Amino acid sequence: ANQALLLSYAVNIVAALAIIIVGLIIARMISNAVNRLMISRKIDATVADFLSALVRYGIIAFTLIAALGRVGVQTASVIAVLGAAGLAVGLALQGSLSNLAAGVLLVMFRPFRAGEYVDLGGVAGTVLSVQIFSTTMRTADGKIIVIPNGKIIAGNIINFSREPVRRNEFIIGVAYDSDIDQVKQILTNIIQSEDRILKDREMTVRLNELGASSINFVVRVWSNSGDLQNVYWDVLERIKREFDAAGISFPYPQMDVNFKR
Amino acid sequence: ANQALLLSYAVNIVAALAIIIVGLIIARMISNAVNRLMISRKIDATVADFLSALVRYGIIAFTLIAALGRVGVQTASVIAVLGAAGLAVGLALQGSLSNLAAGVLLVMFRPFRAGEYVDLGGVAGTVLSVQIFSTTMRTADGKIIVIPNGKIIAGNIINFSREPVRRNEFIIGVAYDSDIDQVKQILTNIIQSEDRILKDREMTVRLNELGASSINFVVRVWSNSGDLQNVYWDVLERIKREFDAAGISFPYPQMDVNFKR
Amino acid sequence: ANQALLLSYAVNIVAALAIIIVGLIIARMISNAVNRLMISRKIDATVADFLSALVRYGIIAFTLIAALGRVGVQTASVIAVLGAAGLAVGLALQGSLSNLAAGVLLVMFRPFRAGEYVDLGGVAGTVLSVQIFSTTMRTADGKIIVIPNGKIIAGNIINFSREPVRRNEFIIGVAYDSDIDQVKQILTNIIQSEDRILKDREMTVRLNELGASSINFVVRVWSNSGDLQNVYWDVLERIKREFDAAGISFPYPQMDVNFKR
Amino acid sequence: ANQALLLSYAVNIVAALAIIIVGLIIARMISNAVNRLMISRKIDATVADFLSALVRYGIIAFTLIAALGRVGVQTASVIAVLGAAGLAVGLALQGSLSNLAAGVLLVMFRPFRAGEYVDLGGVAGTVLSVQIFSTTMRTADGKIIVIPNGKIIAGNIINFSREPVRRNEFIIGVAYDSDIDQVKQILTNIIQSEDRILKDREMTVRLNELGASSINFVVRVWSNSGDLQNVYWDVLERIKREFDAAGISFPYPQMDVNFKR
Amino acid sequence: ANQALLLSYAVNIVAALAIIIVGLIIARMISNAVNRLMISRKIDATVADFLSALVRYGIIAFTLIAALGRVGVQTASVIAVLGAAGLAVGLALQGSLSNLAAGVLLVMFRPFRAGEYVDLGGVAGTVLSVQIFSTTMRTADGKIIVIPNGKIIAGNIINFSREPVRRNEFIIGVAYDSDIDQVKQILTNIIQSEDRILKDREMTVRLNELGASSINFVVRVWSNSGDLQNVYWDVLERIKREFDAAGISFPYPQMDVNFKR
Amino acid sequence: ANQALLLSYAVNIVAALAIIIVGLIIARMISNAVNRLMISRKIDATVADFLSALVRYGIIAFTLIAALGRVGVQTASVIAVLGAAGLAVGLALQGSLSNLAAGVLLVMFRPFRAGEYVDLGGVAGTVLSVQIFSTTMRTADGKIIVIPNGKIIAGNIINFSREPVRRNEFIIGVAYDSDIDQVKQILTNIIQSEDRILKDREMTVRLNELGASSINFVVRVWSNSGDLQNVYWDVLERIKREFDAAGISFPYPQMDVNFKR
Amino acid sequence: ANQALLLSYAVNIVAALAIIIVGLIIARMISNAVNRLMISRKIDATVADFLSALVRYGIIAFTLIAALGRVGVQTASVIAVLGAAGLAVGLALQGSLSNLAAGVLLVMFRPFRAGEYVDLGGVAGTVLSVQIFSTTMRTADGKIIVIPNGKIIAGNIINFSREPVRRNEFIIGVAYDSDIDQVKQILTNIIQSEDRILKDREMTVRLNELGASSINFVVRVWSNSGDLQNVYWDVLERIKREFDAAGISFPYPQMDVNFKR
């Protein structure tokens, strides 16, 4: 006969039923909307169905536990389990989301761009495109390498083509008895004769070290990045020919034997 | 004689009993439904029984603590322990869920497909299929390698067969006294004579470096990926035969001895 | 003389005492039940006693803090400390639970089975059994290796015996002056003479590379996995005998000396 | 003159004082009990005093913040700081607790037992005992190695003495001109003459590879683990003596010189 | 006919509608303001649109769940899921934010500055600029290297140009029979003759070690960082010339043969 | 004119002011007490001032937010920020606290003690003392090494001096033509003649392997740890002298040349 | 006409407006105070402006959400997002705070001090100063190395200059035919003749091992750390001179050839 008890219980049960039916209808409608939108554009059938099933399950679970709490049954354990599952999913997706964030940062900063020869953590090649999750680059041999963006952000990013001017380095080995002045002036003449070698930059021709069987001269020349290999090959061939003509001989690994008995 | 105290306590105890019995019945029914569904399709008996036991235990624990809270006993410690257990389970399953997410990403993006020769972190072979957790690929020797998808997403993904055109590289060593013009023109004629070598692409025949005992010429030719090994073998054999015929000798490791005593 | 204050305090203290005594009795009864069940089956005495003591301590702590909260003393700090302890225990057991999950996944997917020659992260051998936490495999030398399942799921899983057909690879070194046609046809005849070598599969006999002191021919033959070692040994012995008979000599590491003085 | 305000405040302050004094008395009594129990058995004085001080500080802090909350001052910041400290302590003790859990798992599963020759992550020796935190093993040289149990659970666990039968492997190098039939039959006779070599198991005597300066025969024999070293030494000595008697000479590293000038 | 029930429900529904419409209007206005501000300055179109969409979605979700809670439907599960998503996003952005923090610390402390030759974890070059996320440095060869600031803070930071004075080290190998006093005094005279070598600092010329085929003298000289390479090259060339003039011969790798047969 | 509204607001504001002033006074008094206690014993001035400032700031922040909450302003955001800061501090101090815990475990278990020759992760030396955070040990060369206790608990702990008896191992190389019986009996006589070599333990003198240029005999002798180096040196010198006297010659690296041309 | 509803709503809205305006004024005043204090001392302009903007944004956000909660709109989602952001910031700053804590520990314990030659994880040099985040040390070559304090606390800390006495080690190689007594007594006389070598410490001159081509004597001498290099060089030079005078010859890498054909 109480005016508050039975009335309150009836209100609670009616409100819980209304909440659960409204939530189920909204879940069905939102699943319909999301699947319509995903089919209307590019999507994968199986993955899309899996995602739609997961989101519908999540929404209906939310509605069910909300209705249970409105009824009066504590749902703290279910909330804690859902939080643990969410933390597990977040830890699982940490790698993919980190790759996505690294890709966004790479797009915004533009450390490298398409058609630029780079070196991303030990692999060198021309960059084709930079997608959201991973980039695509072609090695000089023609192999395609796909690198996750996280592994690019972590570690060095060497860019060969950013600077128009790069330097070559020659290691020329001649015999000990060879005339140092003669070899130095021959190398200097060879360097001067070339035109693709920049002249305003330093052109060092010095004795680098005293090796085990030969003395190594270091020759450093700067040139535009577009002619580096060609100038290196031409200078090396000219050095070989000029040393052959001038009598300077490249020494083979030399050892001396103290004969006994 | 109070109208609220005894009535409220009776309502609380009756509601708690109703909640616990309803929860137990629902747990039994849902266990029956889930085991029927899992038996009706592919499943493993022992693992399925373990999972059903765990889910039934979780549901009955939820119902019991909800009934205890309705009675009036605080369950915050039990909730915290359940949350800690959930976090432990999530940390344990982090690896498996990360592998699953990586597999989903690989399926969606399709960096590689079945029947495509790839190199996933140091191991090369033809891809057979890409499952949810791990892929299957066959090495050239015929060994089957199963790689977790997380270890594929992390690190480089080299695709040999994506580009139809790849480049070969030859390292040919000849003696110092050999005629550079003669060897270069012989190699050029050998390269020209072949038809499987693409002609629009660069075909470099230059002196690469001055080695310890020999001078190494670098020969680079581009060809379709389907004939790379065959063209390499044919060019190498032709180089051997032509150098033998023309008198150019491949030098053995050469050293000179300064005899004493 | 108040009808609510003293009555409420008496109800609170009586309810707290009832709750704590009921919890203690239930803890004793559940400890009795769990120890009876664990003794009735396989269990370790000391570990079982430790686990029973820990679970009884946890239950009595839950009951005590619930009674304290019913009395009216805040237990939030105790709850937080229990949560921190649970998180510590979960972090500690992360490794063991990850191993268990990996074992469950391995059992369900069956990447490898008993009596199958595999290679799990650098160690090769025949699989004996796959338990919940770790597998057991016997090396070819007869050593027993026990590997945690987490270390198996992480990293590659090479299966030698999955494919019935595998390929052998020979590296045969002959002298430079040897007749290439003669050695190639001799190797071809040796390969043809064998019956265990599959004929529908490719049988390549080509010149692989020009080594420092010898030219290495690559011979590749496919055969059933059950005869791989035997066919390799037989082919190698036949190659040795035929090269000895035909006059082709395997060259020792060859160097030439430019004598001086 | 209000009947509820002053009465409620007096009740609150009296209850807070009673709670704090009861908590302090209980903390003193429990510290007395725990130190009596720890002194009555094996314990370290300084570490025990440190632990008792920490637990007493924790209990008195709990009581103080409970009394403050009963008074009416919010303690949420103190609770959060205590939770952060607990998480820090848990992260610190993660290593020790993981070692303890690994030790418990090792005791329960018994991958290895006392007096069994094992190899735990690169170090080999006889196991003496397995404690809760770390095991003790003696190397063949006599050095004692103590390994944490976590580092044992992580990584492989090789057990030499689990299988009664193990296999030896011989690498015998003879000259190229040596008679293959003669050396094979000599090795076969040597193997047959021994009794400690199991005869039901495979006994392979084949040509393994063509080395740089010698041909290596592979001899594999199975025997009980208790005679492995002895049978290896005896077979090796017999091989040496028989090859010396039969004229087969073990070749030194052989090279040939092409003399010039 | 109740004066509180219907009135309270009407107030709740009207307040919820007002809250949701106000939140939607505020979200639209703040999106307009933020996009106006971002367009007015430097920004990327696609990334800016993505960020604006995400922030608008977050704000509207906040408003919707606030309205739902005002209505009376529990939103604890939605709150937990949002917290899990936030934790996942934080774990994903941990790398980028750590790089930003490292960059801020590097800017504040200034371990290195523009135009200063450094060595950041194995790569050496001149620093160009230090941005928020990553620095830019040019190698001596002319290659541009972009290093994340986190990888710079972690690990050593070697600064070559901080100290104006650096030391060179020479390893000179002479024959065993050479006169130690003569070579030491020759090296001392060579060191004294130079002017770019600092004289107040130590100038050690001692016998370092007895090598396999030569005795190595260690010569250490200090000089300004601006002349280090030049002084090294000049001293080395002078050492070569003076040893050639004085008769001391640099020994080749020397071995002695005990001829037999 | 309301008897509850204005009275309640006045009570709230007065209580908040009393709480904040009491908290400030208590913070000042506790800072005075803690600085008096820290000055009265060993402490560092700057670090102590920093810690006192931090603890006073924390206490005053707690009091301020408690007063704000008593006033009625929600402090949930401040609580969350304080929790995040506490978690950051805990993650930062994880390393130091782990080192402290490892040190406590090392002190309690005593794997090694002062004056005992050990090998903690690749570095060997005599232990001087074990502090709370790091141990101190002196290398045989006299260098002092300080190792964090965490790096000691992680990884192996080799104890040389725990076992009084250790084993030496000799690798003696003799020529192929040497008499095996003669060399074995000579080594046996040398071993027997020594007194510091334990006789009850095994003393193996066997042919270990057939090397490239020599046959290596393995000689194993057990002795007390206090005479290991001395017995090794004495046995080696005696072996040299006896082999010189008996005509057995230690062979140099031997190769044979097949002279051509 | 209700006396509680409209009055309560007016009180709520007025209190919310007062709270938000007070919070904004306090935020402006505290920003003014903090920027005045930071400008009055050493600070960086851009970083200081960034920090002031962040702290002002945080304070105004706190005030806004507090006002919203006072109004009655739930802010749980905003609180959760703020907590997630705080956790992300803490994870980002974990490295910097760990470095700071390690620096504090290093300052307090003083494992090394200024002007003391140390070796911190592979790099050796003299310590200049130890700052809060990173130390500064100068290598013997003169290069400045800045090491984060976390990388110093982790791993070994070798201190060369802590012990005044250190030991040198000589490896002297003589020919097999050399007289062992003669070389030992010569080395003993050389050691005795020096005065900087401590005599109370052990001075071992023994035969260490039988090398491939020479017998290596080990000479160990202890001396003060201030004369280690000088005594080493002097002893080595004296050894060379005395062996040259006494006829003992240091052997070159010796091999013997078995001539054939």
Coordinates of N, CA, C and O in Angstrom, one line a residue, chain C residues 2 9 44 47 72-74 76-78 80-81 84 87-88 91-94 96 99 123 133 138 140-148 151 230 232-234 236 240-241 250-260, chain D residues 7 11 19 62 65-66 70 79 82 86-87 90-91 94 97-98 101 104-105 108-109 153 155-160 162-163 165-167 176 180-181 206-210 212-213 220 222 254-261:
Chain C
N2 N 17.4 8.4 21.7 CA 17.1 8.4 20.3 C 16.8 7.0 19.8 O 17.5 6.0 20.1
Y9 N 23.7 2.0 15.6 CA 25.1 1.5 16.0 C 25.1 0.1 16.4 O 26.0 -0.7 16.1
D44 N 52.0 -31.1 -5.2 CA 53.2 -31.0 -4.4 C 52.9 -30.4 -3.1 O 52.1 -29.5 -2.9
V47 N 54.4 -26.6 -2.1 CA 53.8 -25.6 -3.0 C 52.3 -25.5 -2.7 O 51.7 -24.4 -2.7
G72 N 32.7 1.4 9.6 CA 32.7 2.8 9.1 C 34.1 3.4 8.9 O 34.2 4.5 8.6
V73 N 35.1 2.5 9.1 CA 36.5 3.0 8.9 C 36.8 2.8 7.4 O 36.6 1.8 6.8
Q74 N 37.3 3.9 6.9 CA 37.7 3.9 5.5 C 38.9 2.9 5.2 O 39.8 2.9 6.0
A76 N 40.3 2.7 2.0 CA 40.8 3.0 0.6 C 42.3 2.8 0.5 O 42.8 2.3 -0.6
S77 N 43.1 3.1 1.5 CA 44.5 2.8 1.5 C 44.8 1.4 1.4 O 45.7 0.9 0.6
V78 N 44.1 0.5 2.2 CA 44.3 -0.9 2.1 C 43.9 -1.4 0.8 O 44.6 -2.3 0.2
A80 N 44.1 0.2 -2.1 CA 45.1 0.6 -3.0 C 46.4 -0.2 -2.9 O 47.0 -0.6 -3.9
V81 N 46.7 -0.6 -1.6 CA 47.9 -1.4 -1.4 C 47.7 -2.8 -2.0 O 48.6 -3.4 -2.6
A84 N 48.1 -2.6 -5.7 CA 49.5 -2.5 -6.0 C 50.1 -3.9 -5.9 O 50.9 -4.3 -6.8
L87 N 49.0 -6.0 -8.9 CA 49.7 -5.6 -10.1 C 51.1 -6.1 -10.1 O 51.6 -6.6 -11.1
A88 N 51.8 -6.1 -8.9 CA 53.1 -6.7 -8.8 C 53.1 -8.1 -9.1 O 54.0 -8.7 -9.8
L91 N 52.6 -8.7 -12.8 CA 53.8 -8.4 -13.6 C 54.8 -9.6 -13.4 O 55.5 -9.9 -14.3
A92 N 54.9 -10.1 -12.2 CA 55.8 -11.2 -11.9 C 55.4 -12.5 -12.7 O 56.2 -13.2 -13.3
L93 N 54.1 -12.8 -12.8 CA 53.6 -13.9 -13.4 C 53.3 -13.7 -14.9 O 52.8 -14.6 -15.6
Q94 N 53.6 -12.5 -15.4 CA 53.5 -12.3 -16.9 C 54.2 -13.3 -17.7 O 53.7 -13.8 -18.7
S96 N 55.2 -16.4 -17.0 CA 54.6 -17.8 -16.9 C 53.3 -17.8 -17.7 O 53.0 -18.8 -18.4
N99 N 53.9 -17.8 -21.4 CA 54.3 -19.2 -21.8 C 53.1 -20.1 -21.9 O 53.0 -20.9 -22.9
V123 N 68.0 -24.4 -32.6 CA 68.2 -25.7 -32.1 C 67.3 -26.7 -32.9 O 66.1 -26.4 -33.0
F133 N 53.5 -25.6 -20.5 CA 54.5 -24.5 -20.3 C 55.7 -24.6 -21.3 O 56.2 -23.6 -21.7
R138 N 64.5 -33.8 -28.8 CA 65.7 -34.5 -28.7 C 66.6 -34.2 -29.9 O 66.2 -34.3 -31.0
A140 N 69.8 -34.4 -32.5 CA 70.4 -35.5 -33.2 C 71.5 -36.2 -32.4 O 71.8 -37.4 -32.6
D141 N 72.3 -35.4 -31.6 CA 73.3 -36.0 -30.8 C 72.7 -36.8 -29.6 O 73.5 -37.5 -29.0
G142 N 71.4 -36.6 -29.3 CA 70.8 -37.3 -28.2 C 70.6 -36.4 -27.0 O 70.1 -37.0 -26.0
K143 N 70.8 -35.1 -27.1 CA 70.6 -34.2 -26.0 C 69.2 -33.8 -25.9 O 68.6 -33.5 -27.0
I144 N 68.6 -33.7 -24.7 CA 67.2 -33.3 -24.5 C 67.2 -31.8 -24.3 O 67.9 -31.3 -23.4
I145 N 66.4 -31.1 -25.0 CA 66.3 -29.6 -24.9 C 64.9 -29.3 -24.6 O 63.9 -29.8 -25.2
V146 N 64.7 -28.5 -23.5 CA 63.4 -28.1 -23.1 C 63.3 -26.6 -23.3 O 64.1 -25.8 -22.7
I147 N 62.3 -26.1 -24.1 CA 62.2 -24.7 -24.6 C 60.9 -24.2 -24.1 O 59.9 -24.8 -24.2
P148 N 60.9 -23.0 -23.5 CA 59.7 -22.3 -23.1 C 58.9 -22.0 -24.4 O 59.4 -21.7 -25.4
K151 N 59.3 -18.5 -26.1 CA 60.5 -18.3 -26.9 C 60.3 -19.1 -28.2 O 61.0 -18.8 -29.2
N230 N 71.6 -39.7 -47.3 CA 72.1 -40.8 -48.1 C 72.5 -40.5 -49.5 O 73.5 -40.8 -50.0
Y232 N 73.0 -37.5 -50.6 CA 74.1 -36.5 -50.6 C 75.5 -37.2 -50.5 O 76.4 -37.0 -51.3
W233 N 75.6 -38.2 -49.6 CA 76.8 -38.9 -49.4 C 77.2 -39.7 -50.6 O 78.3 -39.7 -51.0
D234 N 76.2 -40.4 -51.2 CA 76.5 -41.2 -52.3 C 76.9 -40.4 -53.5 O 77.9 -40.8 -54.2
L236 N 78.3 -37.4 -53.4 CA 79.6 -36.9 -53.2 C 80.7 -37.9 -53.4 O 81.8 -37.6 -54.0
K240 N 83.7 -37.8 -56.2 CA 85.2 -37.9 -55.9 C 85.8 -39.0 -56.8 O 86.8 -38.8 -57.5
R241 N 85.1 -40.2 -56.9 CA 85.7 -41.3 -57.6 C 85.8 -41.0 -59.1 O 86.8 -41.3 -59.8
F250 N 91.0 -31.9 -57.7 CA 90.5 -30.9 -56.8 C 91.7 -30.0 -56.4 O 92.7 -30.5 -55.8
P251 N 91.7 -28.7 -56.7 CA 92.9 -27.9 -56.4 C 93.0 -27.5 -54.9 O 92.0 -27.2 -54.3
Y252 N 94.2 -27.6 -54.4 CA 94.5 -27.0 -53.1 C 94.6 -25.5 -53.1 O 94.6 -24.9 -54.2
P253 N 94.5 -24.8 -52.0 CA 94.6 -23.4 -52.0 C 95.9 -23.0 -52.7 O 97.0 -23.3 -52.2
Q254 N 95.8 -22.3 -53.8 CA 96.9 -22.0 -54.7 C 97.3 -20.6 -54.6 O 96.5 -19.7 -54.7
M255 N 98.6 -20.4 -54.5 CA 99.2 -19.0 -54.6 C 100.5 -19.1 -55.4 O 101.1 -20.1 -55.5
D256 N 100.9 -17.9 -56.0 CA 102.1 -17.8 -56.8 C 103.0 -16.8 -56.2 O 102.5 -15.7 -55.7
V257 N 104.3 -17.1 -56.2 CA 105.3 -16.3 -55.5 C 106.2 -15.6 -56.6 O 106.6 -16.3 -57.5
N258 N 106.4 -14.3 -56.5 CA 107.3 -13.6 -57.3 C 108.6 -13.5 -56.6 O 108.8 -12.6 -55.8
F259 N 109.5 -14.4 -56.9 CA 110.7 -14.5 -56.2 C 111.6 -13.3 -56.5 O 111.7 -12.8 -57.6
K260 N 112.2 -12.8 -55.4 CA 113.1 -11.6 -55.5 C 114.4 -11.9 -54.8 O 114.4 -12.7 -53.8
Chain D
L7 N 25.9 17.2 18.6 CA 26.0 15.8 18.9 C 26.8 15.0 17.8 O 27.6 14.2 18.1
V11 N 30.3 13.1 18.3 CA 30.4 11.7 18.0 C 31.6 11.5 17.0 O 32.4 10.6 17.1
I19 N 39.4 5.6 17.0 CA 39.9 4.8 15.9 C 41.4 4.9 15.9 O 42.1 4.0 15.7
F62 N 47.9 4.1 7.5 CA 46.6 3.7 7.2 C 45.6 4.2 8.3 O 44.6 4.8 8.0
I65 N 45.2 8.2 8.2 CA 44.4 8.7 7.1 C 43.0 8.3 7.2 O 42.1 9.0 6.9
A66 N 42.7 7.1 7.8 CA 41.4 6.7 8.1 C 40.7 7.6 9.1 O 39.6 8.0 9.0
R70 N 37.5 10.1 8.6 CA 36.4 10.1 9.5 C 36.1 11.5 10.0 O 35.0 11.9 10.2
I79 N 45.9 9.0 -0.8 CA 45.7 7.7 -1.4 C 46.4 7.5 -2.7 O 46.9 6.5 -3.0
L82 N 50.1 7.1 -2.1 CA 50.3 5.7 -1.6 C 50.2 4.7 -2.8 O 51.0 3.8 -2.8
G86 N 53.2 2.3 -4.1 CA 53.0 0.9 -4.2 C 53.3 0.4 -5.6 O 53.9 -0.7 -5.7
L87 N 52.9 1.1 -6.6 CA 53.3 0.7 -8.0 C 54.8 0.8 -8.2 O 55.4 -0.1 -8.9
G90 N 56.2 -2.3 -6.5 CA 55.9 -3.4 -7.3 C 56.8 -3.6 -8.5 O 57.3 -4.6 -8.9
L91 N 57.0 -2.4 -9.2 CA 57.9 -2.4 -10.4 C 59.4 -2.8 -9.9 O 60.1 -3.5 -10.7
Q94 N 59.5 -6.5 -9.2 CA 59.1 -7.4 -10.3 C 60.2 -8.4 -10.6 O 59.9 -9.6 -10.8
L97 N 60.3 -11.1 -7.7 CA 59.1 -12.0 -7.7 C 59.0 -12.8 -9.0 O 58.5 -14.0 -8.9
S98 N 59.5 -12.3 -10.1 CA 59.6 -13.2 -11.3 C 60.6 -14.3 -11.1 O 60.3 -15.5 -11.5
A101 N 58.7 -16.9 -8.9 CA 57.7 -17.6 -9.7 C 58.4 -18.6 -10.6 O 57.9 -19.8 -10.7
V104 N 59.5 -21.5 -8.5 CA 58.3 -22.4 -8.1 C 58.0 -23.3 -9.3 O 57.7 -24.5 -9.1
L105 N 57.9 -22.7 -10.5 CA 57.6 -23.5 -11.7 C 58.7 -24.6 -11.9 O 58.3 -25.7 -12.3
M108 N 58.1 -27.4 -9.5 CA 56.9 -28.2 -9.8 C 57.1 -29.1 -11.0 O 56.8 -30.3 -10.9
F109 N 57.6 -28.5 -12.1 CA 57.8 -29.3 -13.3 C 59.0 -30.2 -13.3 O 58.9 -31.3 -13.9
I153 N 64.4 -20.0 -16.8 CA 63.1 -20.2 -17.5 C 63.1 -19.5 -18.8 O 62.7 -20.1 -19.9
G155 N 64.9 -18.7 -22.2 CA 66.0 -19.4 -22.9 C 65.9 -20.9 -22.7 O 65.1 -21.5 -21.9
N156 N 66.8 -21.6 -23.5 CA 66.8 -23.0 -23.5 C 67.3 -23.7 -22.3 O 68.0 -23.1 -21.5
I157 N 66.9 -24.9 -22.0 CA 67.4 -25.7 -20.9 C 67.8 -27.1 -21.5 O 66.9 -27.9 -21.7
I158 N 69.1 -27.2 -21.7 CA 69.6 -28.5 -22.3 C 70.0 -29.4 -21.2 O 70.7 -29.1 -20.3
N159 N 69.5 -30.7 -21.3 CA 69.7 -31.7 -20.3 C 70.5 -32.8 -21.0 O 70.0 -33.5 -21.8
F160 N 71.8 -33.0 -20.6 CA 72.6 -34.0 -21.2 C 72.3 -35.4 -20.6 O 72.4 -36.3 -21.4
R162 N 69.5 -36.7 -19.3 CA 68.1 -37.2 -19.3 C 68.1 -38.5 -20.2 O 67.5 -39.5 -19.8
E163 N 68.7 -38.5 -21.4 CA 68.7 -39.6 -22.2 C 69.9 -40.5 -21.9 O 71.0 -40.0 -21.9
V165 N 71.4 -42.6 -23.8 CA 72.2 -42.9 -25.0 C 72.5 -41.6 -25.7 O 71.5 -40.8 -26.0
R166 N 73.7 -41.3 -26.0 CA 74.1 -40.2 -26.8 C 75.1 -40.6 -27.9 O 75.6 -41.7 -27.9
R167 N 75.3 -39.7 -28.8 CA 76.1 -40.0 -30.0 C 77.4 -39.2 -30.1 O 77.3 -38.0 -29.8
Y176 N 94.2 -36.5 -50.1 CA 93.3 -36.8 -51.3 C 93.7 -38.1 -52.0 O 92.8 -38.9 -52.4
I180 N 90.0 -44.5 -50.6 CA 88.7 -44.3 -49.9 C 88.2 -45.6 -49.3 O 87.7 -45.7 -48.2
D181 N 88.2 -46.7 -50.1 CA 87.8 -48.0 -49.7 C 88.6 -48.4 -48.5 O 88.1 -49.0 -47.5
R206 N 81.0 -42.4 -43.5 CA 80.9 -41.9 -44.9 C 81.8 -40.7 -45.1 O 82.3 -40.1 -44.1
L207 N 82.0 -40.3 -46.3 CA 82.8 -39.1 -46.7 C 81.9 -37.9 -46.6 O 80.9 -37.8 -47.3
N208 N 82.2 -37.0 -45.7 CA 81.4 -35.9 -45.4 C 81.5 -34.7 -46.3 O 80.5 -34.2 -46.9
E209 N 82.8 -34.2 -46.6 CA 83.0 -33.1 -47.4 C 84.4 -33.1 -48.0 O 85.2 -33.8 -47.5
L210 N 84.6 -32.3 -49.0 CA 85.9 -32.1 -49.6 C 86.4 -30.8 -49.1 O 86.1 -29.7 -49.6
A212 N 89.5 -27.9 -47.9 CA 90.5 -27.2 -48.6 C 91.8 -28.0 -48.9 O 92.3 -28.0 -50.0
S213 N 92.2 -28.7 -47.9 CA 93.5 -29.5 -48.0 C 93.3 -31.0 -47.6 O 94.3 -31.7 -47.7
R220 N 80.1 -41.6 -36.9 CA 79.1 -41.4 -35.8 C 78.8 -42.7 -35.1 O 78.4 -43.7 -35.8
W222 N 76.9 -44.4 -31.4 CA 76.0 -44.1 -30.3 C 76.5 -45.0 -29.1 O 76.9 -46.2 -29.3
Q254 N 98.0 -27.8 -46.7 CA 98.8 -28.0 -48.0 C 98.5 -26.8 -48.9 O 97.3 -26.5 -49.2
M255 N 99.5 -26.2 -49.4 CA 99.4 -25.2 -50.5 C 100.5 -25.5 -51.5 O 101.5 -26.1 -51.2
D256 N 100.3 -25.0 -52.7 CA 101.2 -25.2 -53.8 C 101.6 -23.8 -54.4 O 100.8 -22.9 -54.5
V257 N 102.9 -23.6 -54.7 CA 103.5 -22.4 -55.1 C 103.8 -22.4 -56.6 O 104.5 -23.4 -57.0
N258 N 103.4 -21.4 -57.3 CA 103.8 -21.3 -58.7 C 105.0 -20.3 -58.7 O 104.8 -19.1 -58.8
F259 N 106.2 -20.9 -58.7 CA 107.4 -20.1 -58.6 C 107.6 -19.3 -59.9 O 107.4 -19.7 -61.0
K260 N 108.0 -18.0 -59.7 CA 108.3 -17.1 -60.8 C 109.6 -16.4 -60.5 O 110.0 -16.2 -59.4
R261 N 110.3 -16.0 -61.6 CA 111.6 -15.3 -61.6 C 112.6 -16.2 -60.8 O 113.5 -15.7 -60.2

